[PDB]
Amino acid sequence: KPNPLQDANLCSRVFFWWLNPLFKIGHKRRLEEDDMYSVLPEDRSQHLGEELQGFWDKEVLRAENDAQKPSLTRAIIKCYWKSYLVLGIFTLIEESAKVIQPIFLGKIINYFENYDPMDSVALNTAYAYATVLTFCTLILAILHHLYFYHVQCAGMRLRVAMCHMIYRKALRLSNMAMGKTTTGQIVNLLSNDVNKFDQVTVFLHFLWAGPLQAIAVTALLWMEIGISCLAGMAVLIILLPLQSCFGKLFSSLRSKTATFTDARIRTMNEVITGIRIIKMYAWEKSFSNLITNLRKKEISKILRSSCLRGMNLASFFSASKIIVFVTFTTYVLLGSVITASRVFVAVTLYGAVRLTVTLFFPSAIERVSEAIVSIRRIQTFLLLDEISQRNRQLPSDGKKMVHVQDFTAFWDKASETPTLQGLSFTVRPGELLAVVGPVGAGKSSLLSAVLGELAPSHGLVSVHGRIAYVSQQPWVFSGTLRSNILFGKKYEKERYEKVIKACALKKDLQLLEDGDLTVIGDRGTTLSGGQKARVNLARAVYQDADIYLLDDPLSAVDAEVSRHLFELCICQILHEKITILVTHQLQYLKAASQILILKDGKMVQKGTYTEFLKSGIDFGSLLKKFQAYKNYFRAGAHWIVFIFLILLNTAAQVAYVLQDWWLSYWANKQSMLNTEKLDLNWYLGIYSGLTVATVLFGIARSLLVFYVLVNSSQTLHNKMFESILKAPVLFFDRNPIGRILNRFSKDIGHLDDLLPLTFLDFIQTLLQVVGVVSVAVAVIPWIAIPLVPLGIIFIFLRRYFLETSRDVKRLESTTRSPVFSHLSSSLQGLWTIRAYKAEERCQELFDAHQDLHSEAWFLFLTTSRWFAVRLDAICAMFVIIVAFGSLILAKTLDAGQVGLALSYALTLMGMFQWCVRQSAEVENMMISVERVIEYTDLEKEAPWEYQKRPPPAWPHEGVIIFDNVNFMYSPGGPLVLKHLTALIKSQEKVGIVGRTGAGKSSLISALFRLSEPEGKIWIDKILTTEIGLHDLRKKMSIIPQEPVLFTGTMRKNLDPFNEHTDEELWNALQEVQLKETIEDLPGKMDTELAESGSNFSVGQRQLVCLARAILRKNQILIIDQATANVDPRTDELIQKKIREKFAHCTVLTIAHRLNTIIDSDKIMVLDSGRLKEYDEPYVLLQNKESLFYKMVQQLGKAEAAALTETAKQVYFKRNYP
Ligand SMILES: Nc1ncnc2c1ncn2[C@@H]1O[C@H](COP(=O)(O)OP(=O)(O)OP(=O)(O)O)[C@@H](O)[C@H]1O
Ligand SMILES: Nc1ncnc2c1ncn2[C@@H]1O[C@H](COP(=O)(O)OP(=O)(O)OP(=O)(O)O)[C@@H](O)[C@H]1O
Ligand SMILES: CCCCC[C@H](O)/C=C/[C@@H]1[C@@H](C/C=C/CCCC(=O)O)[C@H]2CO[C@@H]1C2
Ligand SMILES: [Mg+2]
Ligand SMILES: [Mg+2]
């Protein structure tokens, strides 16, 4: 994609003529990610990232070099001052040509001031000054566009480089660093807190050309009107401190808001992710009050951070109206009198200094004080504890091997007991090491140790070769399943077929519509747990490495699938490769070449299974211990308040214009004078009333617009949140977590503190354009004749540019999400990415994502600054007409009227494109109001509570009956359950088993009405559909497959509704034996449980859930594969404690482990979604042809026999006491 910019001369690069071809493309057909141009090789993400990383690395070096001052990313000005000063030339020429052109305004009004007789030489001089004024407003809207384009691209370079290096760090930060922060925080850096660099640079020059021009203004205004000018500049002085405690105090409010914003976003992430869990526990009205409190404490710091940009845009808008007022109050109270060349050169000078001192200077201060917090937090991030850069690979003897000697390491060094102590093992090619132990032993810690992800406190690890790592939790990332398996490796048909056949994925692909090409959704919500594990194992296998760190890929699959994987995949493909296997399945230890047993970081014994038999040690014992705009504004205040707002806007603009006209009328009344004097009391009285009516109306308008438009983003959010809290879970299945959290972070942020500001800005500058055009028309009515085509051209320019910039903005907004998505995905699988030496490849992929979004942003900037240059050409045509349609029609105009008209036409420039380029941006951040309204009308779930509530003690018995119940995930979707009729009596324990995909969890889903069932489900003769969702769900406890601990106190992970006392909480913890585990923490009830569940043991949080159940005392407990990733220790304690506690409660257990279910009072066997056998496990073992007995036998002969007598004993003891 050749960029025309590198093939564009200066003439066509100033006016962006080179972009005209692209526009010709977009006018007809849609623009897509291919039409864009590749960014210039000077500004790919890689070059920018490398440059700024070199500078910041030299900076962290310098900080730790003879200085010992802390490092400073904001002192990487050193990398942009050379190229972001050459942009100061444009500012210096522009803001010294906005002081020059007022002189020529005075000299063109002087023509009318003296007279306009039949004097050709004076009229020719006026023509010359008008031509000079025109070419000074053309060479001033080219230095306003070259500067304001190149500054936006010099801020884009900083944004892109900073994003690139945030990735380059987030790809190299150690375990502790990933513990201190989260993926939410890093993506917040990359998305919401690096964007500040697109705006820090824009106004950064007017920090010096703000005050400087002010001085110049006085240095040119004294010479006109004497000491009086000081007074005006005096009230200019007061603005700079006052309007900088509006840009630092505002930024203080903004950073004090951002903590509430991210607390709300994180809590919404909890809600969106564990929404299934929240529905099942009926916690909805408990996070309805934890976002309604991190919002109403947020919308108290937005009605103060926006009523402080109201006082900052109403101190800009009415800045020169105060400055001119004070100036001429002093100027006439000092004895002088008003002539409309002093006054209007003063007006157009004080306007040009209003723009810079009162807007660009406080905007620069605010952008710098809002980007300094961004830089501060990005240097907080960039100084995190990065992983130890892999020690130089010593000259190897070519022998690929793993060698671990006296290994000792801490996951957290502050912990007293090390994670591992004194591990020592050597693995040579062809050797299968199987790692066994209890829950929390450190087997995955061991594989991390071989990975180098666990820094040794003592001991040595020497690992040589390509390492393929399967994590204990399978990593499933966005992309096709074939691309998931490839992981960037080249696709080869035969070996891929062999691996898939080995990984038992052939049938799974066959039952899919698209087979292996199916696009797997985010986080693997389209797949099952066993499917995710198989995908992960296949991904590792395909890379055909040397050393394979397998972290128990068999605990997520049934017995037959796990045996298939161990035999065909592990024992055949990995028969010649170095392999370390973590396993809780003892059944494979007989086939392991070598075994290492680990307990509490103790290598208990290392050897072959035969040597372990010879010692007589039992392994079980070892393991047992327009409508959008109406819906937007009306969501704010009543339409009467909007009428008041329109009246207030159009009174502020009429007074801002009537003040200038009053100076003009005063000047005309002074011209036609004489003794005779002018009633100065009256004139200053009216001229002060107009200034006060401008100031107060500007303030009132800028506060009312913000109050209304923040009052709609407090209503749109409160009206969209309450709908996603009631969206049937099908909604969360279809739309990922990211696509729902985005419209609660990005879109609500836009509605909160970027749409009110953009919209008030657009309203205010549109009204000033209306004021300018109205002044010109009322002064030179003939202008209405050339203003008809001059508008039509604009009508054909807004169209012809919105046929493309509706697409380029679309490309940018849709290719911005691949960057963050790839960050999140590459950050979940970070350990796997560093396992392979694939840091550079992921760098290339992320720089390609950033390059694509840089192409999109480059076209956005250049199309906007093509639009703006043509708009300013139209606006200079307007200025030409006013400045020359006053000379050809000189004999008709006063000298105060030409001054008024021309000093308004001159201010049209630069302001026109900003009321036309914000409309095209108001209606683009208003398509983030289709999105926010999109979920305020979603199909809500069934009513939460019907009026006919169940009895308070219901269900007192606990009988669950199915009558011809069919479950489909979506209406008309494939049936997962088919014609179910069953009966579970009071307190009866029934397991539910089948192959992966048998309909197991789907019965749960139909029980909770996750998708509404056809059929009849009876609970103590109560139909499920006849009772509200919360009356039901609060009456069935559940332990899902992956229990979730939500951030905050353990109190709110147990009782965020506070329906109990601390006594019951401690009773529950002592009933889950977690009283001692948490009491050791300083926050016994209030430990800062952080998130993601990487700071707890896998097998313990499932206990908290039953403690939750213990609080709620439900007769119906529903367990869904709880002890799947747990050793026999908790794999017995949970069930025995349940039998002691849920003996009186109907238990509904789903699991693959037949040991955990062998004593179930009944079993529901599901095959492909139908209830095949419903009879006690002993009878199902009686039928030799039963699938249940086959599942038992597939585990091995002795183990199947053991299950046989176990079920036999349970049956006989139950039935024949
Ligand atoms: N970031 C971390 N990642 C993993 N384990 C951690 C981490 N921080 C602390 N730990 C400790 O690791 C243990 C939990 O994981 P561990 O390595 O013991 O699992 P495992 O032995 O592989 O098997 P399982 O987790 O299934 O019991 C606990 O002792 C916990 O305190
Ligand atoms: N998020 C989802 N949306 C729609 N369908 C799904 C989703 N996840 C899984 N499925 C499909 O629904 C079918 C029924 O799943 P079911 O509820 O039986 O899971 P399960 O048998 O409990 O899983 P496992 O056996 O691994 O515990 C499966 O074949 C699966 O492919
Ligand atoms: C908090 C600041 C929000 C508004 C400031 C605005 O980002 C100004 C920036 C410059 C504009 C100058 C326009 C002049 C009048 C602006 C009117 C206004 O800002 O309310 C255009 C030329 O470069 C850019 C676009
Ligand atoms: Mg493990
Ligand atoms: Mg399941």
Short mmCIF file of N, CA and C in Angstrom, two decimals, residues 870-910:
data_model
loop_
_atom_site.label_atom_id
_atom_site.label_comp_id
_atom_site.label_asym_id
_atom_site.label_seq_id
_atom_site.Cartn_x
_atom_site.Cartn_y
_atom_site.Cartn_z
N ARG A 870 -9.95 22.70 3.00
CA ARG A 870 -10.97 23.18 2.07
C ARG A 870 -12.04 24.04 2.75
N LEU A 871 -12.40 23.72 3.99
CA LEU A 871 -13.31 24.56 4.74
C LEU A 871 -12.75 25.96 4.94
N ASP A 872 -11.47 26.06 5.31
CA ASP A 872 -10.85 27.36 5.47
C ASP A 872 -10.69 28.08 4.14
N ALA A 873 -10.59 27.35 3.03
CA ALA A 873 -10.64 28.02 1.73
C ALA A 873 -12.01 28.66 1.51
N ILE A 874 -13.08 27.93 1.83
CA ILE A 874 -14.42 28.51 1.73
C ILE A 874 -14.54 29.71 2.66
N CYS A 875 -14.02 29.59 3.87
CA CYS A 875 -14.13 30.66 4.85
C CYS A 875 -13.31 31.88 4.45
N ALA A 876 -12.16 31.68 3.81
CA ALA A 876 -11.42 32.80 3.27
C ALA A 876 -12.12 33.42 2.08
N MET A 877 -12.87 32.63 1.31
CA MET A 877 -13.73 33.23 0.28
C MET A 877 -14.77 34.13 0.91
N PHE A 878 -15.35 33.69 2.03
CA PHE A 878 -16.27 34.55 2.77
C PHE A 878 -15.58 35.82 3.25
N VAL A 879 -14.37 35.69 3.79
CA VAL A 879 -13.63 36.86 4.26
C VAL A 879 -13.33 37.80 3.10
N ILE A 880 -12.99 37.23 1.95
CA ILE A 880 -12.72 38.03 0.76
C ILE A 880 -13.95 38.83 0.38
N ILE A 881 -15.11 38.17 0.39
CA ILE A 881 -16.34 38.86 0.01
C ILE A 881 -16.64 39.99 0.98
N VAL A 882 -16.50 39.74 2.29
CA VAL A 882 -16.80 40.80 3.25
C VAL A 882 -15.82 41.96 3.11
N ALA A 883 -14.53 41.66 2.98
CA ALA A 883 -13.52 42.71 2.93
C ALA A 883 -13.50 43.46 1.61
N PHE A 884 -14.04 42.88 0.55
CA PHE A 884 -14.11 43.55 -0.74
C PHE A 884 -15.53 43.95 -1.12
N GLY A 885 -16.53 43.30 -0.56
CA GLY A 885 -17.90 43.70 -0.77
C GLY A 885 -18.25 44.85 0.14
N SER A 886 -17.27 45.30 0.92
CA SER A 886 -17.37 46.54 1.65
C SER A 886 -16.63 47.68 0.98
N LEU A 887 -15.74 47.39 0.03
CA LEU A 887 -15.04 48.42 -0.71
C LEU A 887 -15.76 48.79 -2.00
N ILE A 888 -16.26 47.79 -2.74
CA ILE A 888 -17.09 48.09 -3.89
C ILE A 888 -18.39 48.75 -3.45
N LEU A 889 -18.91 48.37 -2.30
CA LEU A 889 -20.09 49.00 -1.71
C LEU A 889 -19.70 49.94 -0.58
N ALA A 890 -18.59 50.65 -0.75
CA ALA A 890 -18.13 51.56 0.30
C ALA A 890 -19.14 52.66 0.56
N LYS A 891 -19.69 53.25 -0.50
CA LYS A 891 -20.57 54.40 -0.39
C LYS A 891 -21.87 54.09 0.33
N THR A 892 -22.04 52.87 0.83
CA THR A 892 -23.25 52.48 1.52
C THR A 892 -23.04 52.12 2.98
N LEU A 893 -21.80 51.99 3.43
CA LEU A 893 -21.49 51.43 4.74
C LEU A 893 -20.88 52.48 5.66
N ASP A 894 -21.21 52.39 6.94
CA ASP A 894 -20.57 53.22 7.95
C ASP A 894 -19.15 52.72 8.19
N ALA A 895 -18.41 53.46 9.02
CA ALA A 895 -17.09 53.03 9.43
C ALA A 895 -17.11 52.15 10.66
N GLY A 896 -18.22 52.10 11.38
CA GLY A 896 -18.32 51.20 12.50
C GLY A 896 -18.93 49.89 12.06
N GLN A 897 -19.59 49.91 10.91
CA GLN A 897 -20.22 48.70 10.39
C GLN A 897 -19.24 47.86 9.60
N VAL A 898 -18.37 48.49 8.81
CA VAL A 898 -17.30 47.73 8.17
C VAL A 898 -16.39 47.13 9.21
N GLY A 899 -16.09 47.88 10.27
CA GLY A 899 -15.25 47.34 11.32
C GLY A 899 -15.86 46.12 11.98
N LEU A 900 -17.15 46.21 12.32
CA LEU A 900 -17.84 45.07 12.91
C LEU A 900 -17.84 43.88 11.97
N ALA A 901 -18.29 44.09 10.73
CA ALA A 901 -18.43 43.00 9.78
C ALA A 901 -17.09 42.34 9.52
N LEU A 902 -16.04 43.14 9.34
CA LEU A 902 -14.75 42.58 8.97
C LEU A 902 -14.06 41.94 10.16
N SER A 903 -14.19 42.51 11.36
CA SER A 903 -13.62 41.86 12.52
C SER A 903 -14.37 40.60 12.90
N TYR A 904 -15.57 40.39 12.38
CA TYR A 904 -16.21 39.09 12.55
C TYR A 904 -15.87 38.11 11.43
N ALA A 905 -15.79 38.59 10.19
CA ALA A 905 -15.36 37.71 9.12
C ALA A 905 -13.95 37.19 9.38
N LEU A 906 -13.06 38.04 9.88
CA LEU A 906 -11.70 37.59 10.18
C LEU A 906 -11.68 36.55 11.28
N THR A 907 -12.63 36.60 12.21
CA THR A 907 -12.66 35.57 13.23
C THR A 907 -13.41 34.33 12.79
N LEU A 908 -14.08 34.37 11.64
CA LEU A 908 -14.67 33.13 11.13
C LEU A 908 -13.60 32.09 10.84
N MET A 909 -12.47 32.52 10.29
CA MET A 909 -11.41 31.58 9.92
C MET A 909 -10.92 30.80 11.13
N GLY A 910 -10.65 29.52 10.93
CA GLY A 910 -10.12 28.69 11.99
C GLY A 910 -11.19 28.23 12.95
#
